Structure 1
Amino acid sequence: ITGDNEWHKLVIPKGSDWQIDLKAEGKLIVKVNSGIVEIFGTELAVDDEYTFQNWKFPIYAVEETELLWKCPDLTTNTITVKPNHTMKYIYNLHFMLEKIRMSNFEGPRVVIVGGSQTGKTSLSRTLCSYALKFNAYQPLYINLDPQQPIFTVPGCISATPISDILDAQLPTWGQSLTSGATLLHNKQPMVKNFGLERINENKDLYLECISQLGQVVGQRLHLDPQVRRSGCIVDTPSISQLDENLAELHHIIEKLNVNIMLVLCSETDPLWEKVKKTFGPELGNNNIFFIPKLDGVSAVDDVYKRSLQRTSIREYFYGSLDTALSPYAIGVDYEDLTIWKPSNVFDNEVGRVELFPVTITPSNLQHAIIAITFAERRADQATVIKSPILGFALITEVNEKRRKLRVLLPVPGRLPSKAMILTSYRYLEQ
């Protein structure tokens, strides 16, 4: 009847989801007593306490499970447990993908295509979790939706080898390497900075990012037999965000050498015939698969999207509850920074593969997330556009009177003497 700070028993029948929506700011602690439960393919160890905060997700019962939960923002009669009838589609896909990893010369390079909240990211997470689960494969997870923070901050597209288990507690899947000892083995991602809020703000820049990611991805696959033998799992932005003719999907298929397509739509959805007609001559129809509506996949508003973007920025510098990190705050002079800004439809009408210089003012830089390239301060825009990303920094304060800035770094030490790119992303209170 009223939220408690005590533990409560929960029996999830086999094949059912415990659907969680952590609307409130409070934490949920879960401890499994017996059975098999999974958060997007990641099994929760028995007796180990798991902590969750501000995210929507299902705890799936592979086997009938008895667990204890502690959360003051939920009561025993406010719990949502519903049977799932869609997992069969996921397993069937996984075991066919797995058959390719064992028998074919190289692993499958799969694209997941579909509409807004069709279950694209949920499928990608489960396929990656399962790839690692049975015969230990290291697939490359490729995120092409910059609004979705996975292993990094929001301005990015990324490629990350799923070399060990994901963090079941995190909406971001897990985190990148740290300087010391951690409970989980963290990830080593390749990040390309788009920096703008939406794909439509540029497109040519978005497509250059894909071109650049595609290149390094090929180089890694050439040198890494284990990642080459496992495949790629490519997650794309919501289909509506891309052009009518789907020309951006041709660029992704070409650049990332895609050979399998998974389409998340309805049985009467025109998407099915559209995709078959365009990508069928290139991939072969046998290599295009239709996945119906996945059970439990819930709609996501822009307020929750912004909540995740905020969480991922703090997680970048400070880590998670179970893994506390020490970022470093420095005072910098106006003279010590070379910041560039990408071309965009708002500021430039068009949106071209071009960077413009940024003048150091509190209106331009306060609370801004900045991408640090590998390029030298003196490097020309052509070199900067093509330069890899070292990391991100947060500009907390900009003082006009004194001509100083306060910069938060993920790494303790000096401010890297490198060319930088201003992102559209902001974060208040370091």
Structure 2
Amino acid sequence: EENVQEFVLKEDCELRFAAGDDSDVCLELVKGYAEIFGTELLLNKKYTFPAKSRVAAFTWKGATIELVGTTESAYVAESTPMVIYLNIHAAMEEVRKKREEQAKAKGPRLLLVGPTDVGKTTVSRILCNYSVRQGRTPIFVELDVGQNSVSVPGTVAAVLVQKTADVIDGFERNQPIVFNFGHTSPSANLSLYEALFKEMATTLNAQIQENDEAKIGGMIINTCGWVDGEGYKCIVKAASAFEVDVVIVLDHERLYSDLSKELPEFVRLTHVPKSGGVEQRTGQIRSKMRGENVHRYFYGTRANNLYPFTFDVSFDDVTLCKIGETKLVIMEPSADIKHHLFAFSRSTKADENVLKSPVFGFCLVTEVDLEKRTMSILCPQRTIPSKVLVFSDITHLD
């Protein structure tokens, strides 16, 4: 945390680096202009990245960048797909302008698809940032229940993006619409997963009728990496449910070939390569990452800490329930709920409505005292926002 590496980037180059397993890396742009996944860097601002961060700082015009601290790897790459990503943004904006002159105008809807670790989340981040920098407010839709960049694992979620991502923390999640799926993969309950994203689409369609900026902002929709078997059919159903105009396939020629023959002819399908900077991650690291996501939901980040409450709740004061493949079941408080997330349902009653109701948020059950009929929960707020708690199979040791 003291030794220094200096890099000169020519136009259209990016510095790719990974922080050591053991320490922070601090990046500073010292000359020119640069961006990290679409967010512009401020000249001479010091950006501190935590252990194991994997980052690319790209420049359109040329830049000089300093890194302070131990890196596992740091090199300048001279060939990237960045112009491709920019041209996708450019095309979307063109569509917005055309529909604005025709008109309230509906923004383009883009579905990003492809297998795991082709940079789908990063590309969605770049596209959302570019939209924001264009003065638009797109809706980012997260359909990946495993690796979710909006809420905890086991959710389908959407958020109006009004500010570029923080280079370190990612997007500010200002009042997301969140549905509790309750599993880390769609395969655990396919019919529910489909019902949820269709409910999401319906909800969003009504929301944007009341908000013209969001309506023309359009949608950038991230799917999970499940592209084979039933995962393929989910992509097709998502494209239909969200009425997408554009499908971007990342690094999967077969999937691109299949969708070309299946999607309605009006849908523009674009195949794009993955960046050579994308890290291929193991199941083990993916699991640790879901864990860190849960931790972040309650405790926030090093930049912006959250201070969650720990208090006891009487089993007389709540109803516990679980979905599933369609039926709600009332759960009797038990030892087996310990370590599980529960969602605070927006439905006032534990009835048919829970299934299609969004949630206020989550709590984590840390202890269960069956004798006293109480549980200890970790919760974002001082009191529970709902008396209806919906089971999630996602567990976390805090």
Which residue of 2 is the match for residue 353 of structure 1?
Answer: 326
CA offset digits 1:45-98 (Å, max 9, x no partner)? 1122212224333222333222232224x27xx423222331121122111111
Which residue of 2 is the match for residue 265 of structure 1?
Answer: 251
CA contact (8 A) 1:217 1:256 kept: no
What secondary structure does 2:346 align onto?
strand
Which residue of 2 is the match for residue 181 of structure 1?
Answer: none
Q: How does 1:250-261 map to 2 (within 5 A)?
A: 250-261=236-247
> How far has the Cα of 1:206 moved from its partner?
0.2
Which residue of 2 is the match for residue 108 of structure 1?
Answer: 108
> How far has the Cα of 1:215 moved from its partner?
1.1
CA distance in 1, matches of 2:379, 2:226: 35
Which residue of 2 is the match for residue 129 of structure 1?
Answer: 129
Residue 69 (structure 2) aligned to one of 61, 71, 79: 71
> How far has the Cα of 1:23 moved from its partner?
5.6
Aligned CA distance change for structure 1 residues 398 and 315 (closer, same or farther; 3 Å): same
CA contact (8 A) 2:308 2:381 kept: yes
> How far has the Cα of 1:132 moved from its partner?
1.1
> How far has the Cα of 1:203 moved from its partner?
0.6
Q: How does 1:207-226 map to 2 (within 5 A)?
A: 207-226=194-213
Could you tell me which amino acid in structure 2 is paired with residue 45 of structure 1? Answer: L
| 1:290 lines up with 2:271 in the alignment | yes
Q: How does 1:28-47 map to 2 (within 5 A)?
A: 28-47=25-44
Which residue of 1 is the match for residue 227 of structure 2?
Answer: 240
CA contact (8 A) 1:138 1:230 kept: yes
Q: TM-score, normalised by structure 2?
A: 0.92
What secondary structure does 2:238 align onto?
helix
Aligned CA distance change for structure 1 residues 160 and 49 (closer, same or farther; 3 Å): same
Moved more, 298-307 or 219-228: 298-307
Structure 1: state its 5+ residue gaps: 177-186, 344-351
Q: TM-score, normalised by structure 1?
A: 0.85
Q: How many matched pairs? A: 392
What percent of counterpart residues are identical? 23
CA contact (8 A) 2:227 2:255 kept: no
CA contact (8 A) 2:360 2:385 kept: no
Which residue of 1 is the match for residue 340 of structure 2?
Answer: 368
RMSD over equivalenced CA pairs, Å: 2.1
Residue 303 (structure 1) aligned to one of 276, 281, 284: 284
CA contact (8 A) 1:330 1:415 kept: no
Which residue of 2 is the match for residue 184 of structure 1?
Answer: none
> How far has the Cα of 1:163 moved from its partner?
0.8
CA distance in 1, matches of 2:392, 2:53: 25
CA contact (8 A) 2:227 2:235 kept: no
| 1:90 lines up with 2:85 in the alignment | yes
CA distance in 2, matches of 1:71, 1:369: 37
Aligned CA distance change for structure 1 residues 205 and 26 (closer, same or farther; 3 Å): same
CA contact (8 A) 1:16 1:84 kept: yes
CA distance in 2, matches of 1:404, 1:23: 43
What secondary structure does 1:240 align onto?
coil
Aligned CA distance change for structure 1 residues 29 and 341 (closer, same or farther; 3 Å): same
Which residue of 2 is the match for residue 426 of structure 1?
Answer: 395
What secondary structure does 1:398 align onto?
strand
